Structures are given as structure tokens and as C-alpha cells.
Amino acid sequence: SGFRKMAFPSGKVEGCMVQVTCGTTTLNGLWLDDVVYCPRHVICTSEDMLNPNYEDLLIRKSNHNFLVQAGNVQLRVIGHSMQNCVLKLKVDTANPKTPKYKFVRIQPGQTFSVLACYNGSPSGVYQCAMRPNFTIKGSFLNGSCGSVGFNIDYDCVSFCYMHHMELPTGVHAGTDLEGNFYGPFVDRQTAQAAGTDTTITVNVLAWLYAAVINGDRWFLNRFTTTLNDFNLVAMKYNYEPLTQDHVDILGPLSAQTGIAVLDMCASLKELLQNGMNGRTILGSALLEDEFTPFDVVRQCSGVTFQ
Amino acid sequence: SGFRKMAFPSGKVEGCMVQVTCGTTTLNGLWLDDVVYCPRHVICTSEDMLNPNYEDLLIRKSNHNFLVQAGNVQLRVIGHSMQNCVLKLKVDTANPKTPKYKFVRIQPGQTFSVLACYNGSPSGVYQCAMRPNFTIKGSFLNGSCGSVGFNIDYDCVSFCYMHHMELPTGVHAGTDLEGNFYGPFVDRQTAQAAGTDTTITVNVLAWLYAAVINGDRWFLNRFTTTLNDFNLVAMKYNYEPLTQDHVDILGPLSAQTGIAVLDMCASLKELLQNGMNGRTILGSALLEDEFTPFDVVRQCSGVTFQ
């Protein structure tokens, strides 16, 4: 028992982190096979970042202008190209620590682990959600750019995020590993704000199932509801619409606990309408929405990685 | 910016995890040099665990009765001994992945990362505190015994916890790596309860400093207090006494923010007396006490490990 915000083991990703320097700008890169991936703003000065023309900045650079360090070893760069907002440096050495891996673009509401890094070295690991407004609520300082987000399935690392920037409110924005931003953000130091965020309804229901599995059952009421009536009520409280796909994904938790998804929806509606009355659920005074149905199953059933 | 419950990178510890089986009991072991450390209740049947005589159970076992697997490799056991509540299996192979390491016994209030494991394989990583009542608020299922807790300093893994059991309330108990329990618990399946827990005052102050560093400053009041008057007020709310050593440890955060420790104590007293008035601090509606002063500095200054 117990329920914690749990990150993936970070070992497979720690073996891929390198330091990349161009001129006086240093940040982190991801070394997979003979390619180093990093944010393209490694090629900017501070000056440049106010309004950079990356194509112009990159034509002026050659392979030898990129310094890549893996511990006390420099990797010779033998090719470079820009894909959207990420730079790919071909190096003369394949990373022997390369795990089985994929690049995925995740959907809003999905979670991942971040390995926060500085100068190519890990600081820490924590779990994040891709927010409905395409920000993440991270912990990132200057030097953290090129830190990545990932999921592990058995032996396979799915890389889904590379860190590029911090927005007002101290929330974070970045790209998939093809260098496409999540959300409408651009890699320029200019006024940008996140849209107003929403609560990820399906994740709140997943966490209420986790509460039941752990014996925290006070909020269960004797009612059911329709998906329709649940969504009209939830909309007022800035909750995502719950779709039939969401109901289907909650199936395994519903079956394990014997609580129909629409009965849990009736319990959540009452919590939204009445509040928690000074009570906690799994130690929290607020409803949590950064656990997916899969996160609850992996933690409560003890899924491991090889 | 941002402030997350951050775990240590787990790679150095993932390389030490093995599966240990004795008869039909399987749990996790920690392989360092040519020694595998695991909980001594690997030698029990279910029956035995109600009231085990471990010395008696162990005289009946020989080296070959212990099956140690590291992936698809069996490690030949060539010696065994019991130290307090941990079994040490000498094996014929030194773990080539052995990091620089130490065994430490931590103090109540100190934090560490747990690498939750099943059948010798990692499930996830999360941060815990040794509670004043010598429990941890973990996430552990059957099969998790032998999972360890650790801190990293630069390149050195300080192992401080090995998991043995779950108490009422779904809190957890275990040993240091010399097999001495934290708290008054014993490795027997019998009625045991944790003492009433306390709030780790120095950690609550550390987290209020983290809030200030992140720009969440509403709770700062215009008053100071004496250590004496602060401790008389805090005692009522089941907060630890704050000692002069605690004040001295908060020095670096105090100096960085320009807020004297006793001024922050005055702000905390007002929060304890008046509550948070429907407000949050760093996203939380409750005061957090599982960040140490060192945890705040490592996260807010970007300390890395090699």
C-alpha cells in the first residue's frame, strides 16, 4: 500500500546525457547511437535569443564549433543539421549505452518522467503531466535546456519531451524529439503566455480509484450519473470533458474495484459541488490530476522495467 | 523556477539490484562488490513469519539453498551470515557496476530516494522522509522487500534504508544496511503500530524558503519571534521543537533570501494559528515537511551527480 508520485528509473536515460557547448552557450544533449540531439538555441548568444534567425546562425557554424563532452571524453562532431527546433550533431562514436528507444509525441493529459540535468550531469528525476495548455509544471534552472522527458515500457525508452524554456507562472515549454513545440510557443525570448489550464478529469478519476485501492473510501456516494450530466457539471469547474475513450481506459481500474466509471463520476461530481469539507484523499487536500489510469495500474500492480 | 518532489537519479542503484530466492520466498537484494544484502525473512515460509526463530531457520540452510539472479545470470553463493535483520550472501562474482558507496544510519527528518523493485527489477523512484516515529510513507507491494533508500553526494551512494514491512495506516518500516530497524519494530508478522507522528518543523521552514525563492511570498508577515515563543506555539500543533542546530542549518537559505530564520518562524506561527485561508503555497493547500534544507538548496541551485 501507499501511493506516491513515482518517476521511472532514470538509469537508461542517464547513460545518454552529454554536455554540448557552442561558443559560450552550454546546455545538455541526448546521445543515441551516433547522434546528439539538443535545443537549436545552443547556437545563440544572449543577444541573439531576443529574435534569432536560426538558419542564419547555423550556416555560420561548422562541425568543429560544437564541443560535445561525455564525461572527460570529447566526441568529434562530423555532421550537423536542424530539424524544426532541435539540432542533430552526428558524432564519430556510437553511444554504447544506447537503450532500445523510440521518439513519441504525447497527448495532453499524458505523464512522463523528467531527468533534470546541468552540464550533461543529472540533478534529479520527477514525474510531470503534459497540461491541456501544452505546458509542464517542471523544476528547471538556467543550464537545464536539453533535459528530456520519457516513459519506459519493459526495456524501451519512449522519449517525448526536450526542455527549451520557462513561461510566466514558472511553467515550462519544450518540444518532442523531432523539435516540434508542444503548444503555440516559439524558441524566442519574447512575451508569451500559456492559455488558461484545465483539470485532466480522467486522471482525477484514476487517482480516486487509487484512493479506493488504498482504503480511502469516504467520498464514495450511493449514486450513478450519465456521462452527459457529469460533463455539464464538470465544465463549470474547468474540468476536461470525459469522453467514451476515457471511460474505456478506466475499465481495468473499474473492474478491479467493482466501481462503475459513472458511479465514480457521481462521487467526483459531489466533491466538485460540495468540496472536501476539510478532508484529504491519499494525504491531499486538493484533487490530483497528474496520475494517468496506466500510472495507477503500474504503481498498484508493481510493473517493472528490464 | 518550479519546485517538485525530486528523487536522486537511480542509475547507480539500478546496477546493484538482484533477485534472491530461498525455497519459495523471493525478494530483492543489493549486490555491492562480492556481497548480496537482503532482508533475513527471505529464509521464512508464510507460516514461519508469524513468529520466526531466524538463527534456527538459517542453521538449516547452506550456500546452495540461496538462488541469486542478476538478469539471466545466477551468482554462485559461497558464504552466508546474518547481521541483525539482514542476510549477507558472499558470491563468487564482484558486481562490476558497484558505485562508490557508504552505509549510513539517517536521523528522523532526513530524506532519501527509494528505488521500488520487484523480482530484482526497478518499478519506480520516489523521495521519502524518515518520519519522527521512524516510519516512511512509501509505496510498496508484496515482493518489494529488499528495495533500498539512498542519497547521492557527487559520485558516492549513501545507502540508508532497506525495506522490510508495512504497518497499519499503510506506512513502512525497515533497517539500515547493518540490519538495525529504524524505530522499535521487529521483523515478525504480529500486531505493531507506529507512535503518533510529528511535523518536521525545520523542513516546513526550508519549504517556505523554497516558496519565497519561487516568488510565492503572500504568507511573509512583518514580525519576528524568539526561538522560545516559536517552540511553545508550535508544540500545540504537534510540530517538532526547532533547535539552534536547525536554525544554523537554515543559514544558507536565510542568507540567500535575506529573511532571518526567526522572521520565517513568525510567519509559520501565523500560518499555524490562522491557517492558510483557502490559499496554497507552491501549489499545496497543506504545509509540506518532506524537503530538507539541503533538498531545497540542491533543487534551487541545480546540484548534479557524477
Ligand SMILES: *[C@](O)(C(=O)N1CCC1)[C@H](C[C@@H]1CCNC1=O)NC(=O)[C@@H]1[C@@H]2[C@H](CN1C(=O)[C@@H](NC(=O)C(F)(F)F)C(C)(C)C)C2(C)C
Ligand atoms: C535554456 O536556454 C538553458 O538552460 N540554457 C543554458 C544555456 C541556455 C533555458 C532554460 C530556462 C531558464 C530558466 N528556466 C528555464 O527553464 N531557456 C531559456 O533561457 C529560453 C531561451 C531564450 C529565452 N528562454 C526562456 O526560457 C525565457 N522565457 C521566455 O522568454 C518566455 F517563456 F516567456 F517566452 C526566460 C529566460 C525569460 C525565462 C529561449 C526561448 C531561446
Ligand SMILES: *[C@](O)(C(=O)N1CCC1)[C@H](C[C@@H]1CCNC1=O)NC(=O)[C@@H]1[C@@H]2[C@H](CN1C(=O)[C@@H](NC(=O)C(F)(F)F)C(C)(C)C)C2(C)C
Ligand atoms: C516483504 O516480505 C516482501 O516484499 N516479500 C516478497 C517475499 C516477502 C513484505 C513487504 C510488504 C507486503 C505489503 N507491503 C509491504 O511493504 N513484507 C512483509 O510481508 C512483512 C514480513 C512479515 C509480515 N510483513 C508485513 O509487512 C506485515 N506487517 C505486519 O505484520 C506489521 F507491520 F503490522 F507488523 C503485513 C504483511 C501484515 C503487512 C515480516 C514482518 C517478516
Ligand SMILES: [Cl-]
Ligand atoms: Cl495538498
